[PDB]
């Protein structure tokens, strides 16, 4: 087993859609005997350089422990996917499960603090500029 940080960037949007998709991303590693450690997130955010053709995004991290050759499934899940525009992995020596400075903290940060980055906002504007009901 292993221990990983996994950060990913969502198209703004899809930022409210991926929290209903977390099952999946967990799984993968929970199928395996891996675990989630963590799930936070930052809001959202500005980029940096535009990604995709937009300057904004929504940042999230999951994280996980895990088999060192099965992590990967999670990388492959992001990647094909979408949403996520993105993602990066590092690792965390069993441990850095804590959490990030913008969440520890939030709160100060946000109001207070600050942040320069982030685009909170957006998100929020979104209430709205964004609307979806299909997948």
């Amino acid at each position: 087993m292993r221990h990983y940080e996994i950060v990913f960037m969502v198209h703004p949007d899809q930022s409210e859609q991926v929290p209903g998709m977390i099952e999946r991303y967990t799984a993968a590693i929970t199928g395996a005997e891996g675990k989630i450690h963590r799930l936070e997130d930052w809001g959202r955010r500005q980029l940096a350089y535009p990604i995709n053709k937009l300057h904004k995004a929504h940042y999230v991290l999951m994280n996980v422990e895990a088999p060192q050759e099965v992590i990967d499934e999670l990388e492959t899940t992001f990647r094909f996917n979408d949403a996520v525009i993105r993602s990066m992995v590092m690792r965390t020596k069993h441990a850095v499960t804590e959490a990030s400075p913008m969440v520890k903290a939030k709160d100060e940060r946000r109001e207070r603090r600050d942040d320069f980055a982030n685009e909170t906002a957006d998100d929020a504007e979104a209430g709205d500029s964004e609307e979806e009901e299909e997948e």
């Binding site: 950060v7 980029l47 940096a48 990604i51 990030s100 320069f116 980055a117």
Partner: protein, 74 residues
């Protein structure tokens, strides 16, 4: 101190974190410029084992679009 230790804060002159980390940006503000390049040790007196770690992290982040790289971006 002694039998007093730890505790009295001592150390952090250097650099404020002594770590690689990138989550965070920020402190990394810092160690960047108006043209996306990193600030050299060095000009700061930082350390290094912490220059590196600062950076990286700046590089990472950035490759997560959290910090500018050229510049461009600024």
């Amino acid at each position: 101190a002694r039998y007093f230790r730890r505790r009295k804060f001592c150390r952090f002159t250097a650099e404020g974190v002594q770590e690689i980390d990138y989550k965070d940006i920020a402190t990394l503000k810092n160690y960047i410029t108006e043209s996306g390049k990193i600030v050299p040790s060095r000009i700061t007196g930082t350390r290094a084992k912490y220059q590196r770690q600062l950076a990286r992290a700046i590089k990472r982040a950035r490759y997560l679009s959290l910090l500018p790289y050229t510049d461009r971006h600024q």
